[PDB]
Curated annotation (Swiss-Prot), chain A:
Homododecamer. Interacts with the portal protein. It comes from the Viruses. It is found in: Virion; Host membrane. The chain holds residues 214 to 245 of 842 of the full protein. Protein that is stored in high quantity in the viral capsid and may play a role during ejection. This is Cargo protein 1. The lineage of its organism: Viruses, Duplodnaviria, Heunggongvirae, Uroviricota, Caudoviricetes.
UniProtKB/Swiss-Prot annotation, chain B:
Forms the tail multi-ring barrel with ring protein 2, ring protein 3 and ring protein 4. It is found in: Virion. GO terms for cellular component: virus tail. The barrel is composed of five stacked dodecameric ring structures. Podoviridae-like phages usually possess only one such ring. The tail is thus rather long. This is Ring protein 1. Homododecamer. Its main location: virion. Keywords: Viral tail protein, Virion. It comes from Bacteroides phage crAss001 (Bacteroides phage PhiCrAss001). It holds the Pfam family CrAss_Ring_1.
Amino acid sequence: FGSGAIGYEFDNRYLNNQEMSAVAKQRLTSLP
Amino acid sequence: MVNNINWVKLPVILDRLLRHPLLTDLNLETAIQYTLDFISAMGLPNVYVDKIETIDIKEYRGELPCDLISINQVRLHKNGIALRAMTDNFNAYPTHGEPSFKTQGRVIFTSIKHEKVDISYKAIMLDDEGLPLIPDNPIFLKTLELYIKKEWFTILFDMGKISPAVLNNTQQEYAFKAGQCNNEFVIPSVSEMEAITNMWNQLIPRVTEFRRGFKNLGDKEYIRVH
């Protein structure tokens, strides 16, 4: 059948947690 | 301070913040509170307006002006002799000297019963509205802008709406400009280093400048030829 309001929010939340991991590897380094 | 403090209204800081699309929900109301927190935390005595008022002391107590923020000196009106500080624990209290003062709220507590005193103090400069007025210094303005951007991003970082790398950059950039803004307002002009020169170079040391209003502090010391 079909209804995609919980498939959407779980997929949108998995890409959020994957994006959250990617921005936690960002470093503005502090050697010369 | 080397540069003069030209006054501008608080919404000039909001042209600068709302250039940033994450700071577009900022207000005048939020700009008012974060300015006064910033003005206080820096503690620059050049941002305040110097005022002098004569108040009368009724019995070891006098009512202080409404705009008062910090007292420069209190002195007597008839003599001009300055008052130092109340270290007495039992001041206006009888059992069965050098005059003093003490201030807690809107009341000053002196050592003299019935006397008029001059109070030289600092207030905040206001507008036609009763609102703060900030320097147009683009160093002051930039680091007040970075102050509000760091308080707004700290909320957004607690919410999870900002990267920890984004807040770490704002916390770093505010930290540099806050020292540059401190040194911009503290480091004397050429005309204030001359008064600093005359105080520093004194063959007969002048050690009673508090009795005057520090009037003769930066005066030059002259020695006769013999």
